[PDB]
UniProtKB/Swiss-Prot annotation, chain A:
This is Clathrin heavy chain 1. Clathrin is the major protein of the polyhedral coat of coated pits and vesicles. Two different adapter protein complexes link the clathrin lattice either to the plasma membrane or to the trans-Golgi network. Acts as a component of the TACC3/ch-TOG/clathrin complex proposed to contribute to stabilization of kinetochore fibers of the mitotic spindle by acting as inter-microtubule bridge. The TACC3/ch-TOG/clathrin complex is required for the maintenance of kinetochore fiber tension. Plays a role in early autophagosome formation. The C-terminal third of the heavy chains forms the hub of the triskelion. This region contains the trimerization domain and the light-chain binding domain involved in the assembly of the clathrin lattice. The modification N6-succinyllysine is found at K15. Residues 124-204 are annotated as: Trimerization. The modification Phosphotyrosine is found at Y51, Y61. Clathrin triskelions, composed of 3 heavy chains and 3 light chains, are the basic subunits of the clathrin coat. In the presence of light chains, hub assembly is influenced by both the pH and the concentration of calcium. Interacts with HIP1. Interacts with DENND1A, DENND1B and DENND1C. Interacts with OCRL. Interacts with ERBB2. Interacts with FKBP6. Interacts with CKAP5 and TACC3 forming the TACC3/ch-TOG/clathrin complex located at spindle inter-microtubules bridges; the complex implicates clathrin triskelions; TACC3 and CLTC are proposed to form a composite microtubule interaction surface. The modification Phosphoserine is found at S68. The modification N6-acetyllysine is found at K15, K75. It is found in: Cytoplasmic vesicle membrane; Membrane, Coated pit; Melanosome; Cytoplasm, Cytoskeleton, Spindle.
From Swiss-Prot, chain B:
The gene is CLTB. Clathrin is the major protein of the polyhedral coat of coated pits and vesicles. Clathrin coats are formed from molecules containing 3 heavy chains and 3 light chains. Interacts (via N-terminus) with HIP1. Interacts with HIP1R. Belongs to the clathrin light chain family. It is found in: Cytoplasmic vesicle membrane; Membrane, Coated pit. The lineage of its organism: Eukaryota, Metazoa, Chordata, Craniata, Vertebrata. This is Clathrin light chain B. It comes from the Eukaryota.
UniProtKB/Swiss-Prot annotation, chain C:
Residues 1-79 are annotated as: Trimerization. This is Clathrin heavy chain 1. The gene is CLTC. Clathrin triskelions, composed of 3 heavy chains and 3 light chains, are the basic subunits of the clathrin coat. In the presence of light chains, hub assembly is influenced by both the pH and the concentration of calcium. Interacts with HIP1. Interacts with DENND1A, DENND1B and DENND1C. Interacts with OCRL. Interacts with ERBB2. Interacts with FKBP6. Interacts with CKAP5 and TACC3 forming the TACC3/ch-TOG/clathrin complex located at spindle inter-microtubules bridges; the complex implicates clathrin triskelions; TACC3 and CLTC are proposed to form a composite microtubule interaction surface. Disulfide bonds: none annotated. The C-terminal third of the heavy chains forms the hub of the triskelion. This region contains the trimerization domain and the light-chain binding domain involved in the assembly of the clathrin lattice.
């Protein structure tokens, strides 16, 4: 352990077709954050089908090629990695994961949750505009959008009028923002009177 | 074997707070759960 | 209390859910929705919901007005 360079080892294993023996050799190790470790280590958890470890095998040590790695995963059939390659590519960057969907990997599930944390607001219109032409859970769509502060402005609340006459009734949220914009109004009128009150007082 | 086996198993079993709720809630339109109660009740309530 | 009852036992809910509203606002969002949970159909009537609209668009008038009051005097006495 102590007083090897590791960098000059995994190399002799890889071009050996026998590197996995070192599987556990990578156990107590991999604290070194070394590349050859994660790098083939992932390659290992990939062809071996390991996700628990692989996921945790990177739940801390971030030393690797955050790219091609997810390239071999996407080429899979077993979504486990087509699900993480989805993550792996997104990684603390939500824009990738969504802007890369289409029929497949369009899960009526996580797709309604990975948008929320976003910041490119308009992408909501992107997603939503799409919900309309290709899906029907637009409800949960055009809604989970709204409730977080407001990313669903007037612009969208109308787009649906010109467009879809029928289809729009749902609201949970539109009112969440209503008395919200009726409560911030509460405290505001309150401080307005604050002012009024003190003024009239000190100057009557 | 087992992994591809674990594979098929799926496709086989049939602020923060607010978000989590809404999520584990969905199924609204599926049948207007927000009418029966669940969807509508939960959402409205922990949504205000 | 009354309204929730109007729904299950009477139909003049119109005059109900309305005469309620027109007075300041004691009929918040809370109630305007309580009626949705149920009645997809049955809700169109408004006289009042808009009485509060430009009301909350007029108090906004005078408010923007005093906002400009401030702006105007400030910019004046100082630049």
């Amino acid at each position: 352990s102590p007083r090897l360079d590791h960098t000059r080892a995994v190399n002799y294993f890889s071009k050996v077709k026998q590197l996995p023996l070192v599987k556990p050799y990578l156990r107590s190790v991999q604290n070194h954050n070394n590349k050859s470790v994660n790098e083939s280590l992932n390659n290992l958890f990939i062809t071996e089908e390991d996700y628990q470890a692989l996921r945790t095998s990177i739940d801390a040590y971030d030393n690797f090629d955050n790219i091609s790695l997810a390239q071999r995963l996407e080429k899979h059939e077993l979504i486990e990695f087509r699900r993480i390659a989805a993550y792996l590519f997104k990684g603390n960057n939500r824009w990738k994961q969504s802007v890369e969907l289409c029929k497949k990997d369009s899960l009526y599930k996580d797709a309604m949750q990975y948008a929320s944390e976003s910041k490119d607001t308009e992408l909501a219109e992107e997603l939503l505009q799409w919900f309309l032409q290709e899906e029907k859970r637009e409800c949960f769509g055009a809604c989970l959008f709204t409730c977080y502060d407001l990313l669903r402005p007037d612009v969208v609340l109308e787009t649906a009028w010109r467009h879809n006459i029928m289809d729009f009734a749902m609201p949970y949220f539109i009112q969440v923002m209503k008395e919200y914009l009726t409560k911030v109004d509460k405290l505001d009128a309150s401080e307005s009177l604050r002012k009024e009150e003190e003024q009239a007082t000190e100057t009557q | 074997s087992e992994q591809v086996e674990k594979n098929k198993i799926n496709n086989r079993i049939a602020x923060x707070x607010x978000x989590x709720x809404x999520x584990x809630x969905x199924x609204x339109x599926x049948x207007x759960x927000x009418x029966x109660x669940x969807x509508x009740x939960x959402x409205x309530x922990x949504x205000x």
